[PDB]
């Protein structure tokens, strides 16, 4: 038996996180050995039944999709139990925790009538997206994802330093001090001549003056997704603030 775990992302973030949580509940009790790979790691389970216990652990914490195959070794004649060698192929959804993700049109109008240009907040069993301009959330089960798989537009490496000047709140809040207009300016164009950006963000409560936040700076990127090309360009924000520090 083998639970082949794969994720198609070069920068592993969720793949690091699964190694920490596999040890907390300590699901690795029945591993004969642990091998790794290019884009994941492989496990070895002395009986068939120890592997099905593990997939039911992975179903609760991370979006997966699995299927099985087998092969013959012995072909025993008397009993009939021909001692096959099973294999389980697990694939994770390639969206990371703070990706910039442009939704397709049919999927965006199905859930919440949300705008297509969202972030990600809860990387857990369902993937939760969040519109940073106007706060509204929606969940995406893996059964809805793999029937039409898309990609993430950006990743956690295209983030730029930003320096907050003030926090101008509008007042409406979901649970986390929503829709604060933030006057922000990059670390690069701070000392040189004055260039100021002004944007809404969900980061209203934990944000104060003189602080460093990270965010996507859309105005200088030439993306090449067709979902991004099928938008209305003069509605796209310039900056999407992601996190503090």
């Amino acid at each position: 038996a083998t639970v082949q775990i794969r994720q198609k992302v070069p920068h592993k973030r969720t793949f690091l996180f699964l190694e920490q949580l596999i040890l907390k509940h300590n699901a690795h009790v029945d591993t004969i050995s642990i091998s790794e790979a290019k884009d994941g790691l492989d496990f070895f389970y002395a009986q068939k039944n120890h592997a099905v216990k593990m997939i039911d652990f992975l179903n609760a914490v991370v979006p997966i999709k699995h299927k099985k195959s087998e092969e013959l070794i012995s072909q025993d004649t008397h009993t009939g139990a021909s001692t096959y060698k099973f294999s389980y192929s697990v694939e994770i959804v390639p969206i990371c925790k703070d990706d910039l993700v442009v939704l397709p049109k049919k999927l965006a109008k199905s859930m919440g009538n949300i705008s297509q240009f969202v972030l990600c907040s809860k990387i857990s069993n369902t993937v939760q997206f969040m519109d940073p301009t106007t706060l509204q959330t929606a969940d995406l089960s893996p059964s809805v994802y793999w029937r039409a798989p898309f990609n993430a537009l950006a990743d956690v490496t295209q983030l730029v330093e930003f320096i907050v000047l003030d926090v101008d709140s509008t007042g409406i809040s979901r649970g986390n001090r929503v829709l604060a207009d933030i006057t922000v300016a990059r670390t690069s164009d701070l000392g040189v001549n004055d260039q100021v950006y002004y944007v809404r963000s969900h980061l209203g409560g934990i944000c104060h003056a003189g602080d460093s936040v990270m965010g996507y700076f859309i105005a200088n990127s030439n993306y090449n997704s067709d979902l991004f090309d099928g938008l209305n360009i003069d509605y796209v924000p310039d900056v999407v603030l992601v996190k503090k520090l």
Binding site: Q158, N193, S221, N222, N224
Partner: protein, 102 residues
């Protein structure tokens, strides 16, 4: 990457034929503009029964476009195109680089 807004390169406009100052802007695609020839053909062929008659490309693998610049001369106003390599971040103008900093 970063390119400046003012670039001095060769002009070919029947009066200059020499290096003059150019302005640098970024290339934008342009509208699809139906009543073109392939569109009036494709508008005829879809009509009727039979459904989709042309292939629709799905398996896309790139993540960047090449950056194209259009260089407009300031004297004779004769534009010229000039391409660059693939890059994920293209802004022009700001952040002239300084090496010695904290």
């Amino acid at each position: 990457v970063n390119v400046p807004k003012t670039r001095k390169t060769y002009c070919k406009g029947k009066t200059c034929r020499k290096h003059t100052q150019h302005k640098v802007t970024q290339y934008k695609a342009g509208k699809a503009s139906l009543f073109a020839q392939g569109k009036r053909r494709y508008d005829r062929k879809q009509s009727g029964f039979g459904g989709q008659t042309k292939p629709v490309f799905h398996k896309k693998a790139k993540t960047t476009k090449k950056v194209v610049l259009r260089l407009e001369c300031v004297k004779c106003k004769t534009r010229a195109q000039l391409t660059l390599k693939r890059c994920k971040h293209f802004e022009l103008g700001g952040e002239k680089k300084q090496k010695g900093q904290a």
